[PDB]
Amino acid sequence: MIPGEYHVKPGQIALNTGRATCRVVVENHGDRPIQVGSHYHFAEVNPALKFDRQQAAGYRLNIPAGTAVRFEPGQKREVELVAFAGHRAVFGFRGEVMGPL
Amino acid sequence: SNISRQAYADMFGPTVGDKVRLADTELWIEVEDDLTTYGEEVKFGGGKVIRDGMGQGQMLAADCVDLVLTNALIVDHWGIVKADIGVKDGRIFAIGKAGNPDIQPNVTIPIGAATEVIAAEGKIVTAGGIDTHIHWICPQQAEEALVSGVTTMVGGGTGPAAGTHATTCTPGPWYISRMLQAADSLPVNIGLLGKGNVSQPDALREQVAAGVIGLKIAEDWGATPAAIDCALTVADEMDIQVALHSDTLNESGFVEDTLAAIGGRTIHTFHTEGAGGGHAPDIITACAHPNILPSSTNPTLPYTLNTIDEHLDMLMVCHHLDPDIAEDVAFAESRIRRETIAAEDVLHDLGAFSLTSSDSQAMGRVGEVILRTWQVAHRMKVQRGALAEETGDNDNFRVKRYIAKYTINPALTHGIAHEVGSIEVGKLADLVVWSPAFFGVKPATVIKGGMIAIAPMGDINASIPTPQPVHYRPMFGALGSARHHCRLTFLSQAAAANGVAERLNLRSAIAVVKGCRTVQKADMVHNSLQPNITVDAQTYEVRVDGELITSEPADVLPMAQRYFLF
Amino acid sequence: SNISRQAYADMFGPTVGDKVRLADTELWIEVEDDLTTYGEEVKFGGGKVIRDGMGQGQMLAADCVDLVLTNALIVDHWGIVKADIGVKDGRIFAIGKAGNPDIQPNVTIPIGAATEVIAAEGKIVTAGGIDTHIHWICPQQAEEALVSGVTTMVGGGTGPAAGTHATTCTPGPWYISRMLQAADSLPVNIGLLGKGNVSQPDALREQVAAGVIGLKIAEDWGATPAAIDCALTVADEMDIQVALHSDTLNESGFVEDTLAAIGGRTIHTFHTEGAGGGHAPDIITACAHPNILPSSTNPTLPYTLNTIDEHLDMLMVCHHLDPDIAEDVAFAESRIRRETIAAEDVLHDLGAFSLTSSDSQAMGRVGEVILRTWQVAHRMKVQRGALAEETGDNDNFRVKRYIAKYTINPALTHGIAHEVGSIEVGKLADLVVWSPAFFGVKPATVIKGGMIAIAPMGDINASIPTPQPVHYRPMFGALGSARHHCRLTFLSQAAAANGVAERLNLRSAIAVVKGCRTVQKADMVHNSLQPNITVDAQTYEVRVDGELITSEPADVLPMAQRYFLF
Amino acid sequence: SNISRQAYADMFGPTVGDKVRLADTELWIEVEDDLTTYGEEVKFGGGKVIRDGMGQGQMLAADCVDLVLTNALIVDHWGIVKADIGVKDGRIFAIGKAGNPDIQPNVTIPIGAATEVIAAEGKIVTAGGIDTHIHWICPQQAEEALVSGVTTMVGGGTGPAAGTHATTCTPGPWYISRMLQAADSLPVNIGLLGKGNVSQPDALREQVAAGVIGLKIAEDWGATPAAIDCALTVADEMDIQVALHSDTLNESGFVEDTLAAIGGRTIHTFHTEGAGGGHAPDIITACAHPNILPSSTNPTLPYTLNTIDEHLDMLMVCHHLDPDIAEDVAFAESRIRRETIAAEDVLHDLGAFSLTSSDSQAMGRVGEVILRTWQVAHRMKVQRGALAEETGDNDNFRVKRYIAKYTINPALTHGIAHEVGSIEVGKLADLVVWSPAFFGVKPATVIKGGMIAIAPMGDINASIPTPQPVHYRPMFGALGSARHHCRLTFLSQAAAANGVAERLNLRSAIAVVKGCRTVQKADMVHNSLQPNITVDAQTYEVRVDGELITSEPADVLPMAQRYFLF
Amino acid sequence: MELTPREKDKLLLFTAALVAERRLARGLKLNYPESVALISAFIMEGARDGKSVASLMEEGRHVLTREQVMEGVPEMIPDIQVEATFPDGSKLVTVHNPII
Amino acid sequence: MELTPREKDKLLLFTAALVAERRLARGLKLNYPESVALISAFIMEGARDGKSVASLMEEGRHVLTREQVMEGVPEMIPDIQVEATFPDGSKLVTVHNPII
Ligand code: NI
Ligand code: NI
Ligand code: NI
Ligand code: NI
Ligand code: NI
Ligand code: NI
């Protein structure tokens, strides 16, 4: 007996289903670490990350909400992106789009 | 991508199909539905989702909610679902999917710059309790009640005076006016009951016009057929509720005579089992009628080993009786019957008893209405198993039946369900956040009108709010004007019309009671059973359709010694 | 029928001829009269008398009282009688026989639906004490005073500042205005004293127009003939009282010069014995004059074994004196004389000293004015026996003489006796209920303006109000607006006329002081003796008509170690 | 006549040339000037100077001060001088020689009948502290802060909700309005910060018009270049301050990008060292810019042996991070660097860091801003000796440099220096009186707007205010309306114009912020250094002009175990 | 801990009992407030141990005797009442004439 | 004494610990509030003695064992946090899984 215990049924949850995704190779050319969040517009991450910004347009990381991918200096790795939904209107970040798309 | 269900629960709280044990009881609830879109859940913190342009949008204040409770496991009479809760203007705005419509799908609760966030992932959210049997013996009762999760308090009294010790009555215009002004200082919604024991209608009408939302008929002031009929006549013409504490001494007639006096008119029977008052030994038979809204006071809930022993002296002190006067002791003894005490638990489980209340410091414990209601649920599951209405391998239905007893049912009974009582859009945001391990015992957060009013708080000079000693302390929602704005003082339609609020210069928000005459047993959510119940005059045995109703006294209960320091 | 006197007392409290011991002292009071009709007493409780159509009637609110204190043993300057007390509109309505005129005889206090009931059978009821020597060093003093039974507090100060530490002065318009606003938050009637030490009348008039009800002349600010005469001139033209703390150093003249400066004008002399301040060593001779209203502060009451030892350092800290400065220590020592301390007790017993006060945190104990007054009564009975005015085998007269010292006499002296001071019809309902065993020590109930403001209260979550721990907690009469309605802020006639209450936006009820210039020693109830008293300049011996006045120091006192935890 | 300097100090406090040790630290201050005329000092007490016609005059209220602090040793950014302080209308009136012009020379502060007196001889008087980094997690923080000597609190929050736990933001019109009303109940000057994280200017303008005096950019809500630029644009057009908590994750760019986003516009950087938040590992380089007003939060002050060990879990709880999530733990670890923690102390000593604040219950201790600032001063003297600006054999300059950090500098930064921040004529009378032995730890008196609001107070029933137990209790300046009159609620110029105070019906005095856009590093009193600072990306070493900046961790500190019971 | 107002209140009772306990240990005849606190604290620990209400109503009358308290104290206490959390919830213990 | 609000608050913790300490002495299996108070008070005295934060974070896990507390209590306390005045100022001690 454990007060307030859960009895989670076994299995898994498939996240962001039925949405376009793409894989991109990213490399941190900065001398300092960079950590990117689950919902940050990837195309506008720190300029030190070298990748095809053009492909990651309107995309975010395909990772469970609230988690992140860290890039230590000089780190290179392939990440999977998932396309924004809703109105697909990007506002904020580095101010590169500030509108629909 | 993919995430295992266990890791998922650890981050966002349980989802569809997962079960959670309520505190240390034997009750398990199962998430019936989850309103989120997997992978699109909103979470707050450094580097999380709720950030500009991401899970938070560019909308103005009028277009987003003021407060969002993220990933909340809602437990209410209508369901046990996982969802986000949006609060706007101190009222419940929506129950759905919170986020930024700009980049997220199915967002029904928009989060903007003007939105505050309360993280409910892994927590259980319920509406604020409603105690309709308060004796205003001391102002300190409000904080005790609020800490336990009760956000609305109905009753009467003028302080520690003989009359209030025994009955829930704020006698007359002057005291009613005084108590209405004093209510602005308390962090809970309040509604007053006047003294309904009079055979002159005008003496009652004055009290109703002064502001009371109901009239209390207590035997200590004479609960005779004439008094009862008089109160019901005024109640009928002013749309207010009547609370009854019948004639235990059978001085003016038996229970059937009282029932005759009522004449099929709507009425709320207090402590229907009888220990706290009522015709000996069969007041419990009132629960069989369609116009009676029956409730229990808490000391007899649930039936335990020490229940009886504790009752005699409690009753003497409450009602100002004398142990050196034989008739006074026989009066007390005639009210305490093991037979009806045991039946009461079962009748609650069947839905024959529709409400639970305290009877604060007058044969009741103000901070134990929620706690005892769940103790009864536990003991009944242990003794009678699943209810005929259960579906699935959980206690979801029994949970819905019991939570309604101190939330929506008390609200329907007193005509305030239009403002409080449940988590439904448009209702005042009186919510209580619980951690599954302390459900029904110690709340994590108590929200009044959209502002946290009391919560556990650690060392004030600490680097974070968690270090010891952690004990309940008043928050901003309980301070001066912020409080006035976040609480409601319930008036009668007449008092509202007369401009009582303006004359007394009340500072809090005003709510008006309505629909007190039209509610009947059938309207009590999950508790509308009208059983063919009988009580043996000699043995006091309770029978429903001839079968014997009874239960066994508990020696140990959950939500007891594992949580309290004393 | 017939009932034995003992059984009768057990149910309804003592009646004519019965005696009751006050706490653990050697004082006994005897019921002088009982205003009831035997067999027709009203009693509240389940199955009792106060019930619809029986002891409660059908009258409207305007025709019955709001509160009734049943079977109360009243102790006041005018009598020690058994009667019911009716309260209406926050004021004393009647002292007679409560009940229902429909079926009961001689009912003068009608009980209806609008009537709340407080059961006083077996209890002693007195008016609320009035302390006229308060130093507003901290707001916490109000609750301490209220718990002890003092409902009105007069004095001055601005908080813990050097000036207030030493004197009862709220200096000037700004501080007076500030303290008047702060007073709305305190649960006691309040009246402020300004700094009267000035030789320019206009500086005094401003303060009076700002709101003070009197002016304090303290030596710490220079109590010179010029200052004294100036204050008295303004007092004479504005109808306010002057409180005096004379020139101990004899710097400007001796006592006879101060008396010359006063010139036969009405004045209240603080701590007339001298320990707390005044011409050394004969300020005590002031009590011989018709225009002097003499009072004692409490540390020297009564003369005990530890009195002297405790006084030196107390005096140093209060008046900001330096023990490394010879003249400062000699000043302190010249004020502490065993001879006058011993005489003071006797002079109170004879009626030469008319008031007792505290001198809160400035050579006095705010919660011990009542307690010490009775300790003096006890010690005097023990040493001098019955007073020449006693009749019967009781101490009824000595009790009337002493209770007047902290009730009516302080009220007459400060011109507020028209509102408070005694239990008489039309006066504000500031009453205190005591259990005979705790009389003068710990009250059972403290009522302010018709509402209980503070009372002992047990476990808040308990099934009744009696379980431990029982300690004093604030009630509804001390909350927000209810409090504003139940307390009075005494203004000067000028301040009232100027619209000070409206300008400062005071929320409490306003009372105006009047009759401060016309009261004289002869008006002090049971304490109007003007003795031919002398003090030997060398030995400090006090003599009245040549005979030596003195008493012995007590080693143990009642109302002490048997009641307090510390 | 003649009096020895020692005897003089014992009576009137130290004079020119005398030195005083601050608490138990190694800092000594030396009286630079004394504004008195020897032999003409004013002193209060029985038989002292401040008496009618002597040290007190015949002037009317308008011609004398309401409060005088006699013989005070003032410690402020402008000097360490001995003088009397006159207070009138809740504002500082003069700093000079108090007395009666009728008989005394050089009297600049006239004492009359309307003057209250506070004896400061032997005490140190400073202005009230100003904490600009408050998280409104609980109302209890105000008293904790007030007791420590901080009289003004700036920040945001809505109570114990996730958002406020992590950031100083009162999100939107409804919560801003609620918190503004709640602020009337608190005994400190308050100003609110809204949530500035939005890329839509209108969402910010609403908040400013609702009442906030600044906008907080926290990374928990996304501190991206777009959000930062948006907040600064509105700040520029509404004259409000921006507080920044940069992007630690370097998600949107490095520190140089954030600095680019700011574009030379005025901004207040919170916890500039980085532990409490900001670009890893070089946010500390911000202190090199002219438009940046840098401040430290208190847990890293000063560098001690237990600093590091304590930081990790503190950070996790504050920002709602998960220790089972690798990226969350790496985030926390990247913020805690021994290298920058050690440099921070030195940078404060050099004047590169201009403010110290708490970060109340969100990686900071609300009652330790003053205490820790002095601990840093002590440790720096011990390690680096005298500053190049010292003159004489004292630490007067280091004391002026450090006291400015929590008084005038925070006031200039947030545009409220016109009302508070220092002891200068015309400024609100928020003063704190200290006994040299408890300087910076436990105040003797805390004055708010000319009225004592909190002070140590002994036994309430005692014969004097000194007997034990002596602990801090609220005074008259913290009660109802008196408090409203003695505190200020700072609004934005727009909110003032819109009539927000009238609409919300705020009861306190209103002050408006101005001059937030024009302050720059050069305006920070004694702390305007703009060093050429660098941080090694790999080793985190801090360098100024190539030289290594560092210090050693303390094992024991003053103002610690000798003063606290726990 | 999440101490509610009622638990904090009981801390006041417990502390008052500590004071009485030490004085009795010194051999002092207890006064009114010391006696009530001592016997009350006793019952609370009784409930913590798991004793029944009926047992405590009895045992409560054997904590202090008439010769251990000051004169008049036994008559000033016709009964003592206190509630505590038993294994089966909060219950009221009433002890009549606790001091004999 | 000049007790600030925070010192008076800690007096509440200390007293709650006195209650727990005595029950443990009787051989009772401690409950949730008693356990938190006991271990917390321990750490405070640790700081008073002058032990470092790192030492206490360790020692705090050896005050009570799983067999000294009621069932479920160990899981109800994933960590315990308390601050006290060390020789080098106030510091936060966090003890993870204090009961094993
Ligand atoms: Ni009842
Ligand atoms: Ni009741
Ligand atoms: Ni005096
Ligand atoms: Ni005095
Ligand atoms: Ni921050
Ligand atoms: Ni912060």
Query: F23 CB near a chain E CB, below 8 Å?
Result: yes
List the CATH code of the domain at E1-100: 3.30.280.10
Q: Which chains touch C (3 or more CB pairs under 8 A)?
A: B, D, E
Domains of chain A: 1-101 (2.10.150.10)
Q: Do A34 and D250 touch (CB under 8 A)?
A: yes
Residue type, D546: G
- Distance (Å) from CA C132 to ligand 4 centroid: 10
Distance CA D39, CA F18 (A): 57
Query: E14 CB near a chain F CB, below 8 Å?
Result: yes
CB count in 10 Å sphere of residue C418: 16
Q: Which chains touch E (3 or more CB pairs under 8 A)?
A: B, C, F
Q: Structure solved using which method?
A: X-ray
- Residues from chain B that touch E1, judged by Cβ atoms under 8 A, are 468-471, 565
| Closest ligand by atom to C364 CA | 4
Q: Do E16 and C565 touch (CB under 8 A)?
A: yes
- Point out the domain boundary residue: C479, C502, C525: C479
Whether residue D179 is found in the same domain as residue D219: yes
Q: What are the structure tokens assigned to C236, written together?
A: 């004479």
- Report chain C's C-alpha Rg in angstroms: 24
Q: What are the structure tokens assigned to B505, written together?
A: 């210069």
Closest CA to D511 of D414, D439, D375: D414
D293 contact partners, CB below 8 Å, separation of at least 6: D266, D267, D268, D269, D354, D355, D409, D413, D519, D520, D521, D524
Does residue B191 contact residue B154 with C-beta atoms inside 8 Å? yes
Beta strands in C100-247 (DSSP E): 109-110, 116-119, 124-127, 129-135, 150-156, 189-195, 214-217, 241-244
- Residues from chain A that touch F76, judged by Cβ atoms under 8 A, are 3
Residues with CB under 5 A from ligand 3 (ion): C 245, 276-277
Distance CA C67, CA C116 (A): 5
Give one DSSP letter per residue of D463-495, joined into a string. Answer: SSS-SSP-EEEE-GGGSHHHHHHH-EEEE-HHH
- Point out the domain boundary residue: C443, C462, C479: C479
Q: What are the structure tokens assigned to B142, written together?
A: 């409000």
Whether residue D440 is found in the same domain as residue D379: no
Whether residue D108 is found in the same domain as residue D194: no
Q: Do C468 and E37 touch (CB under 8 A)?
A: yes
**Active-site position among D319, D348, D414, D526:** D319
Q: Which chains touch F (3 or more CB pairs under 8 A)?
A: A, B, D, E
Our CA-based measurement puts residue E60 at a distance from the nearest CA of chain B, in whole angstroms, of: 15
Tell me: cis bond preceding D469? Omega within 30 of 0 counts.
yes
- Point out the domain boundary residue: C463, C479, C495: C479
Query: Residue D533: which H helix or E strand, with range?
Result: strand D533-535
- Distance (Å) from CA D533 to ligand 5 centroid: 22
Give me the active site residues of B, please.
Answer: 319
Q: Domain with C471 in it: what CATH number? A: 2.30.40.10
Distance CA B148, CA B143 (A): 9
Owner of token pair 């969100």: D362
Does residue D504 contact residue D181 with C-beta atoms inside 8 Å? yes
Residue type, C329: V
Tally helices (H) and strands (E) across chain E: 4, 2
Q: Is the dihedral of CA B253, B258, B261, B263 positive or negative?
A: negative
Distance CA B355, CA A42 (A): 55
CB count in 10 Å sphere of residue C239: 19
Query: Residue C498: which H helix or E strand, with range?
Result: helix C493-498
Whether residue B441 is found in the same domain as residue B329: no
- Distance (Å) from CA D86 to ligand 3 centroid: 26
Distance CA C54, CA C58 (A): 10
Give one DSSP letter per residue of D351-418, joined into a string. Answer: TSS-EEE--TTSSS-TT-HHHHHHHHHHHHHHHH-S-TT--SSS-HHHHHHHHHTTTHHHHHHTT-TT
Whether residue D21 is found in the same domain as residue D152: no
- Residues from chain B that touch C52, judged by Cβ atoms under 8 A, are 197-199, 221-222, 224, 226-227
D315 contact partners, CB below 8 Å, separation of at least 6: D275, D321, D332, D335, D336, D363
Chain B residue nearest residue F76, CA to CA: B437
Does residue C101 contact residue C128 with C-beta atoms inside 8 Å? no
The residues in F 51-80 lying below 8 A from A, measured between CB atoms, are 71-72, 75-76
Distance CA B112, CA B518 (A): 42
Query: Residue D261: which H helix or E strand, with range?
Result: helix D255-262
CA distances, C518 to each of C225, C239, C241, C514, D184 (Å): 22, 9, 10, 9, 45
Kind of pairing, strands D431-434 and D124-127? antiparallel
Whether residue C302 is found in the same domain as residue C320: yes
Whether residue D430 is found in the same domain as residue D502: no
- Residues from chain F that touch E18, judged by Cβ atoms under 8 A, are 18
Distance CA C372, CA C301 (A): 6
- Report chain A's C-alpha Rg in angstroms: 16
Number of structural domains (chain D) is: 2
C286 contact partners, CB below 8 Å, separation of at least 6: C255, C259, C269, C272, C278, C292, C294
Residue type, D60: L
Q: What are the structure tokens assigned to B46, written together?
A: 């450094």
Distance CA F23, CA F35 (A): 11
- Residues from chain E that touch F12, judged by Cβ atoms under 8 A, are 3, 8, 11
Residue B448, sorted as left (phi over 0), alpha (psi -120 to 50) or beta, turns out to be beta
Does residue D309 contact residue D222 with C-beta atoms inside 8 Å? no
Q: What are the structure tokens assigned to B464, written together?
A: 């974070």
Distance CA C166, CA C137 (A): 10
- Report chain D's C-alpha Rg in angstroms: 24
A83-A88-A93 Cα angle (round to 5): 85
Distance CA D14, CA D5 (A): 8
Q: In whole angstroms, what separates CA C111 from the centre of its chain? A: 31
Nominal resolution (angstroms): 2.5
Give me the active site residues of C, please.
Answer: 319
* Enclosing domain of residue D92: 1-127+422-479
C7 contact partners, CB below 8 Å, separation of at least 6: none
- Distance (Å) from CA C147 to ligand 4 centroid: 21
Does residue B132 contact residue B155 with C-beta atoms inside 8 Å? yes
Q: Is there contact between A and E if contact means ≥3 C-beta pairs under 8 Å?
A: no
Buried b or exposed e, range F73-84, using 16+ CB within 10 angstroms: bbebbeebbbbb
Give one DSSP letter per residue of D348-368, joined into a string. Answer: HHHTSS-EEE--TTSSS-TT-
CB count in 10 Å sphere of residue C361: 32
Whether residue C101 is found in the same domain as residue C243: no
Q: Do D367 and F4 touch (CB under 8 A)?
A: yes
Q: What are the structure tokens assigned to F75, written together?
A: 């899981």
Whether residue B197 is found in the same domain as residue B256: yes
Residue type, C54: M
Closest CA to B310 of E52, E44, E41, C458: E52
The residues in F 61-90 lying below 8 A from B, measured between CB atoms, are 70-73, 75-76, 80-83, 90
SS3 A34: strand
CA distances, D253 to each of A39, C116, D67, D167 (Å): 16, 72, 55, 21
Query: C496 CB near a chain E CB, below 8 Å?
Result: no
The residues in D 381-410 lying below 8 A from F, measured between CB atoms, are none
Whether residue D167 is found in the same domain as residue D277: yes
Owner of token pair 């011996």: C541
- Residues from chain D that touch B51, judged by Cβ atoms under 8 A, are 197, 220-222
Distance CA B152, CA B147 (A): 12
Q: Domain with B211 in it: what CATH number? A: 3.20.20.140
- Distance (Å) from CA D228 to ligand 6 centroid: 17
CA distances, C507 to each of C89, C141, D420 (Å): 18, 21, 31
- Round to the nearest angstrom and report the end-to-end CA distance of chain E: 39
Whether residue C397 is found in the same domain as residue C533: yes
Q: Do D143 and F5 touch (CB under 8 A)?
A: yes
SS3 B167: coil
- Report chain F's C-alpha Rg in angstroms: 13
Distance CA B229, CA D4 (A): 92
Whether residue D58 is found in the same domain as residue D165: no
C435-C439-C443 Cα angle (round to 5): 65
